[model samples]
Target: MALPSGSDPAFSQPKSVLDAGLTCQGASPSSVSKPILLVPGTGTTGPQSFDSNWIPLSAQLGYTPCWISPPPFMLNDTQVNTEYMVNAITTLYAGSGNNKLPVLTWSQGGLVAQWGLTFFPSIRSKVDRLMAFAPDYKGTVLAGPLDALAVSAPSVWQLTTGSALTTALRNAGGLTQIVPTTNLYSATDEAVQPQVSNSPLDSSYLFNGKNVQAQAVCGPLFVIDHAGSLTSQFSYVVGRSALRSTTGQARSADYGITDCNPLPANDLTPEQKVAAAALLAPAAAAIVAGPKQNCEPDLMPYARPFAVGKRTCSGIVTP
Candidate 1:
């Protein structure tokens, strides 16, 4: 299938760069049923986070794997990052002959994907389900040094625990729960901490959300870091089960709660190693080399609930 034009009237992001962000498997969606989009985290660009593991694996699972990594990385305004996701969703869903596309995200990508589902209401009906790994749903426990460093990073404030963006998303009149989602995280996560506050567990009764911990299925000794959640086999199993769930949510019981490793296997071929490293190096460098700004970037005007009338964008326009 042909790639999307990556063009949008309202969004000013350059068309060429946006087109490059979406990389399909050469030249085909190939008669497969599963067409999942992969997204990256804070430091990693889109495919850099997953090409090392999920991309090929998902392809083997008969999925038409396509990754969405927008420009300016993940440190900028999340609202702008979310628009790229919306653009990709529109093109991908349109090409899938109207199938509700399933989304699989790593870390902050989950936030952007869900943001698209929430703010751009029309995008919700087109989504099949969301399987998020170590997602940044709520504000994370931010540290002072990084806070000072990423002061101008718009994402820094939004991802901070209890920030205005997080609060708005929570009080979004049930808009956050519009798409059925399964969020998988580890209790021993190195980054996002105070799990209760940052990554709250979901009850089975909560049909819209299901939170599963790695240790719950992999034993108390199981350990998986923030990055591993996207690459680990444990997450793979849970993601698979979530994909199989027909009830708009995933459950740990569906796969029988079996034990497994929680890391990307080191037994990669030489070619795979080269492919992963080459792409990841630049993504890593971009953030490591990022400069600190004066202060945290303010929330998008649209993100703010009241500007004396309605949301800056489509809140008043019925989707």
Candidate 2:
């Protein structure tokens, strides 16, 4: 399905580093022997989301870093995002002497990459490794209120827990089954329900034969949330390992404390805590306010309704 008009001009066309029309930062195309494609999450562009960590990581690791710039605010539909990914993969694969590329995604970008692999099975062959951070492969409970308010953004609705998009990806075996995919998630994530946001329950679908919990790997001393996952030193270790490993060899179990030194902070700074609270206060307020005045019912038949004033979604209590 096409995204509604005026969503964002960037979404109007494919925005891959391989696309001549789009300018890419870090590592000249000719200098990069192996390319790693980075996909960003909702409300963020690829550079805005992953560059800080990836740029320095890629330069030191000797890999070409490419990125997919999705529409601002992530208002574009997932279908459109998937199509863009497919095209980018096609171009990258062809340019790499038909060698598969490693894929790194965050948040909603994980779903977009999964959709491309599922719908376009051929793209799977072009992927050497897949690593996603805080991915909503099973959708997220946080979107319930936005969905309840009948937000016009199709992408937001697609992220509601049990939405058709997430269900279809699950049925298709998700990212792990598609390629050497690694699922990295946090237990303290406030943006996504940790239960659903964590690795897939099916052990057979994991990369390197297992999934990972950031807290478990880092021990109880570490505290990383959704955004922190991208910038934290822990992410650098896992991502570098995945990028350096040959296909089918990336494993979270293999990563040790020595790999990540001066471990990422265990707690958000006081300023960061206040900032985080400020970011979520509006969403909490919105849920407490209930759906928008006379909000129309959901048009998508597969969308599940929010159980207002209940703890069903992420155990969040709403009046």
Candidate 3:
């Protein structure tokens, strides 16, 4: 895969990084550390469905893309879901002989990935990065009622509760070991409140004692015409760049300013690339510095502790 235009050589595509089973069109084998395991946001779509969502970005980064086969919405339980996702991760490792691949979760899959991490501590070390796109780390208001009203919509119900799942996420030791978690969210997501989606669950709760590097990437406000918000071309463009920035690759020059607008003009450009790097350099520095700051950690006593912290990124937080 060709690197995005104006990308530096460090992020250029590699000749051979993993088995073709995981490779997408124009995947750069070198820029990424492992084949990315893409967890779909919701619905029962598999690799092909998600492939449509993430292939463009993976191709741009020269990284291979794989997907998780979740059970039909009716069959998704915490245990069953973990087994399903872990099985896919195992296959990816067996095929690549690489244990450090990242799991990029979209929408509800973000919460699902968090569940997997909490239940499978042994595999925690294998997760190099976690990119949560509009995840529900904390319970969502709509999720609770959505689940109770419609068992048929298993995905919706799974995200509403703040049960053991919520506790596990708050106390997830696995996240402490993770480096560069780029949590991408939009301000106008109709499925989830912008406030909930952009919460610092990664920084405030997950990384309290642990040394994980985390950042919140807020995209521009956009209504969830549902289709336009989740599966649109603009979502892919913003989503992919967020993935790359979190993975430690320098931010592309093409991303325009860090404001919350969905215009194509906001994409990275030669000038924007420099701006983008400027936006993420501090985060990159923090990652290299390791988690050394000893500020008071926020121990989440409630299922929804995100409400306690300031949601804004203090700096130009993007990649």
Candidate 4:
């Protein structure tokens, strides 16, 4: 459910926050306990919109795939979105009879989770593992212009009036106190500049304070990049199941994935070929293969917006 817009703290922290959490399934071995909670990045698609992308993956992996409700998919502000999500998560865990849940938040959702961990103590204990894909942990170049505009006088009033997300992020120094966190980034992300995405990983606050891992995938500059990877429905399922295997635990986290090839291509300059091979490598290999660091696998599967062979609209707005 969506939160109302206004200056009231209640509106900012809508009651829906404690509403029944969004429904979803898991994507991992049946042996795993908590189901995966998929948190979508910015853009307007509902939690259901990501089903096609996560379902097959979940099925293959054997973990129940769960999604948040009230679709913060494209609501208006990040703070309100995080508030609702925190409520949804708390409700979900209390109902599941479980205390902890593994979280996978994509893009801005990552930042949202960061806020969740800080403000919602319920999540700190209930959340076992956290993964943020192509997250705007440091804000993004694409969002930079908007944030810049928002920081200006008139717009500043607009941002401060409602959820005060801009203020929260500016003051999110508390994120350093949370549990282990994994940051998954893509060097090719077109939505956010890589340099900005990499900023969170480098932040001494995040690195030294808690167990934080940072990973980088090599292709698909946009969420659309996932579209080209799933060749068939079966392949799509297999991909999701394999994701957990790729993302394990790690220390001093830094990872890169490169394996998106039509048909194993060997032809290329030495550097290009090496880079391609790097992408093809598994999440564990990508990390451990490099410098020795106590780390876990951060799987980067081939996930598209829908089932394989399915095409979807582009951008936040439909044509």
Candidate 5:
């Protein structure tokens, strides 16, 4: 049976938000084999961020696709979004016939997914592996001081290297992987900066994580940036390889995946094309859709014990 989250504490969001935020595995896990979950990032809705690309593409490759699209572009509070994601994962896990499901995240959604697993540790084992592209763990050097959503939404500032949230997350062991995870990064990433600090991929380690550069794995990339990581076929090959691994780590060479190949239009079936078409409306709607946040959502209550005491950010005086 699927998870009945009606009484679960980790799932504390409004019932409607929890219910509307997810896709696939409704009453059932859809009885899907090779199931995968896709969580999206900032600035775009779920359909905008993934439906046109990941959903249909992975389906054609034999993996059943599922997703979480909460608060539109994930422009709301991180802790609140975690509850929505918590609901999706618990429900997604059991419906997959008790099998582990791999997760693919885009940009800020990486924070959302990891936050869910980190705080609500019970669901860690339910996930097969995490495949994250350009997770803004270190935040960014760009957009210093302020950015577009800084006034109303905290995500923009929270993503700044100077923000209290990033500092708090770092202190809470947020950068440490709670599950087997593969991180793919591009040196040209406009957001989520300083490649060395992001993952290092050196003598130092992120415990239970594998960090890779797209260029190191492939040849000199013609297209390797924050968003390019999602559009290019190279990211898909590497991410898919991670899901294909016995240990959930990615290996581009393992499957002999070709380099710099764009997602070929010829490979998609007619039905898959229709599935992609359905994503258009949501993607279009997202261009003009987003909630009006008066200010950053309260993160102090969600702060782990140490971070609460360690950070003296802005209005947060003490633990």
Candidate 6:
């Protein structure tokens, strides 16, 4: 069943945002009618990752916005992060008058949330919807070199393609039956291989009819790289639609892109913008380099010719 709307005495209500341990800008829990939880990717804090992106929009949309700060740097084990997410969801559920909360996550946070849903199915009952941005559902090839180094972060190791943890998660049917899930990825993403890892054609674990590519809906003109997926206006529109959707229904009909502008300027303060840009530089670089040649063969099945610039390819291509 979908979560209850409005006030319910069965669940505790937060007197204020601080009481809920949320830093996202929004009204106090008592004043809001619906709740939405935001989860950040690896090495990112919740506020800095999603607040600028969703906080203002949530206010206009009339849903309470909240987020939890996961351990820094993606260093924590994914299973451990799952526990953290479970606890956060549990707290949010209770604090929101027992209403099921929709989750919006980016990158590795999506994997952690899936881990919670897979290992702790009870949490599935407490979520209304899920919208994962640029998630590494099939794992990523970027971890290939790291595995050879014998130096690994638990979450990073688990996100490597074909890792035991990832394979098990897929076998468990991650997000397949839990709730209405929208997997939003970009075909031009450089961090996660665009053709296979992020392509709808590569999605086997998602429930049928829920996988969507930004380009598929918005056209090839809408270019959003890995980092851009989290900060771009295109992602924001998709997320808003997903959050407003009725439980168990696909939000694809809500998809639309109004502009093909480059990455939007982040709505961060001067200090925060500098910090964020510093952290995001490497990811932007990877996107500029396009997909790695080492991972090209793995993506062949899903690739098609697309113009990147003056150059074009007979095989897998990017624009």
TM-score of each: 0.79, 0.70, 0.56, 0.54, 0.79, 0.70
Off by over 4 Å in 6: 1-33, 145-149, 175-177, 194-205, 247-250, 257-262, 265-319
Candidate 5 C-alpha error for residue 50, in Å: 1.0
lDDT of 4 at 237: 26
Ranking by TM-score: 5, 1, 6, 2, 3, 4
The C-alpha stretches of model 5 lying farther than 4 A from their native spots are 1-11, 25-33, 148-150, 196-205, 219-222, 255-258, 262-295, 309-314
lDDT of each: 0.64, 0.57, 0.44, 0.41, 0.64, 0.58
- Which should have the higher TM-score, number 1 or number 4? 1
Q: Which stretches of candidate 4 lie over 4 Å from their true place?
A: 1-21, 25-33, 46-49, 69-72, 143-167, 174-177, 194-319
Compute the lDDT of residue 7 as modeled in candidate 3. Answer: 17
Summarize candidate 2's per-residue lDDT along 228-268 as a digit string, tens digits. Answer: 66556677667666767665545656577664432332243
Alpha-carbon RMSD, each predicted model: 6.6, 9.2, 15.9, 15.7, 5.6, 12.1
CA displacement after TM-score superposition, residue 108 of candidate 3 (Å)? 1.5
Candidate 2 root-mean-square deviation in Å: 9.2
Candidate 4 vs. true structure, TM-score: 0.54
Cα-lDDT of candidate 4: 0.41
Q: How does residue 94 of candidate 3 score in lDDT?
A: 52
lDDT value, residue 197 of candidate 4: 41
Which parts of model 1 have CA positions greater than 4 angstroms off?
1-17, 28-33, 144-152, 173-176, 196-207, 265-284, 306-319
Output the worst ten-in-a-row residue range by lDDT, candidate 1: 197-206
lDDT of 5 by residue, 152-264 (tens): 34466556664566666666676777788888777667665676433453211245688766656554554466766665567667776787788788864663335565332
Residue lDDT tens for model 3, 251-317: 4343433533433223334443343223212323322332222121222232123223322113211
Residue-pair clashes per candidate: 1, 0, 15, 34, 0, 0
